[model samples]
Target: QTVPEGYQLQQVLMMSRDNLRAPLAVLEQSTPNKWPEWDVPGGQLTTKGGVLEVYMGHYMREWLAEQGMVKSGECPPPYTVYAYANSLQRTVATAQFFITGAFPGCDIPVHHQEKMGTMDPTFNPVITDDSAAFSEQAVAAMEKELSKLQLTDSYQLLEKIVNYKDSPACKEKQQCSLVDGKNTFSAKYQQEPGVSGPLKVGNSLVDAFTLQYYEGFPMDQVAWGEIKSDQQWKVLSKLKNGYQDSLFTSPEVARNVAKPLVSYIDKALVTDRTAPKITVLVGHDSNIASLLTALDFKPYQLHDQNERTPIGGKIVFQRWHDSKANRDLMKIEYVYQSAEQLRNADALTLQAPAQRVTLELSGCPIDADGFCPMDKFDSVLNEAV
Candidate 1:
């Protein structure tokens, strides 16, 4: 099927990953290349990240206007807009900044748990089944996926950029071989599953370098200017993407971990009549990854961004009223800033928009323009939940 016209956009729901953030952990003296100082602490958003989010908010508001869902240059009805984010500082702050830009001075409140560092069930991706059998199954699934992502080239490249041979870990501790360690996966009680050894270590380094790249460091400082092209970036990032995808994307693991999230999304899309017309729910990248796998989201590659689920990327699920057919439709897209856009802190406008990829919601038979009948979309979500 081709693009369906005469569809009036009804409501929108979005799940967004946090924007540019400081590394969760810094290797520091372990590597010869000096890590750049961050204005914020580890795993938190930078000021520039907040700025970029505001720009996205501005663009989002413009889009709503274009869709004829809201009036131009004015706030919508009070109950029409709502936002919620994970309790983490970065996720909450991202929602705040985005709302500020999207509804400039509209006084829309962003909701999240009051307890610091608490994982909200709706957004949490922790291992839900602690049974030994379930753990074994999840671990097996991860290992099978891991077999295809062996990254000898990426390991060598990471070592070269970090000067690992000259660094303290290898030079002093005799932990010289990056490819020698045995990679293992573990499922813990009420926690995200873990990967140990080389894969985990590489994941951290790739994250640090990725943060440096998105933080707008001078080219000479990013990966010490060794990673100069998108291909190189992708090669380097495969480790990070690989680690995440392997751990979270396996069907058994995804179904178990993403149940709550899928249920929440299902409620908003079908059962919850009280949900706002424009809703934003912000959580971690892992949550999005697992949710996608659980829902049978089709595979697709993105250009201009190295990470498969790039930072600040949003999965937007929109409900469209096909007035001619007297039915509702579902459309999904992944919206995020491009490499240059994020690096330059580009202002996003209606004309100069962010990168948006129409995503196919598999099992429902989406059309050429990515529209699926709402009933079919609901069925998919219901089965996943």
Candidate 2:
């Protein structure tokens, strides 16, 4: 393995939080006696007091702080969680972009969402209530089923699956792959033992087809215009130059500008021996795609805004050191850009390849300093690992 000069190998984890919107909403709306699998009770679509995203983020920060990671801006510095108000189709892509911006040495920071077009169905953050998100039936079923098992056991199994799914080596290989109409993974387990069908988004059987169609959602609408062509090339050029160009092509350009700011840090890491091994990103989906494309990895499948990326899908990069020659280069490993893969993963013994360590840490109270307090879910998060 070719390593950076004077750099030692350190095991790092980078995972996206899973099904946060759905689960949070379900928990928020459920009463003590009534719960359903396909929807939540009392028409409550809110996620655990309408702030599950914030809570989950703070909980993660508290756990990381306990691990001795540097605290930045009241939370874990150098790392941040990407979340959304609703489970939109492009939410995951947005989270990916945000993370890239948090870390330096990260090239490519913005890619055109329009080029990918819209593939799967996404929920509107405003319109998505607990009932819409989890479905009353689904919530009741999940609570009854999930509540029966020990929380520790359930959490452990979930963590194990997520951790293994986001391993670095697996990320560099085949976590994300393009699915044409003919060669898609079948959803044998979308509703199998542990996996429920109604909970799964879109058409579980088809790779690109989504079953949850809502009125007025941006399912087939192309959100990008006039700048679709050469979108990937423009992003690549910008990454090499640290994103110092005016002719940007995506709405995420504002967020992408933050990358060059980290250039100073990247330079130091290249030459210094004490730099942290893990790079935490904090941008959006566009940022993630642009950065991945800049590195020559196709992060987005269709490249049109009409088709959005999933909330927790990933595009991973790996650093390899050739033992014989001792040179280091970044390699594009796997791109998990589809929810179908995740739904199918619940059944298949074969794991997808990707280098990401995602977690679903929710339930923290926001503090007066505009940050969440660390004491809330620290115990739960600490034990989660």
TM-score of each: 0.96, 0.29
Weakest ten-residue segment in model 2 by summed lDDT: 178-187
| Model 2 Cα lDDT, one tens digit per residue, 1-385 | 1223443222122323222222222221111222123233322222321222223233333333433343434433232222221233334333433333332233323322342433211111011222333333333443343333222222232223223234332355454221111211111211111222211211111111121111111333211111133343233222212211111112122122223312322332233245344433323333443333222222233321122333334333223343454544332222233333332322211132222221122343322221222233233223221
Q: How accurate is candidate 1 locally (lDDT)?
A: 0.85
- Global lDDT of each model? 0.85, 0.27
What lDDT would candidate 2 get against the real structure? 0.27
Kindly list the per-residue Cα lDDT of model 1 for residues 136-217, writing each as its tens digit: 9899999988888868888888888888888867765655877777888998879897898888888888888888877888
Scored against the true structure, residue 105 in model 1 reaches a CA lDDT of 76
The candidate that wins on TM-score is 1
Clashes of 2: 80
Candidate 2's TM-score reads 0.29
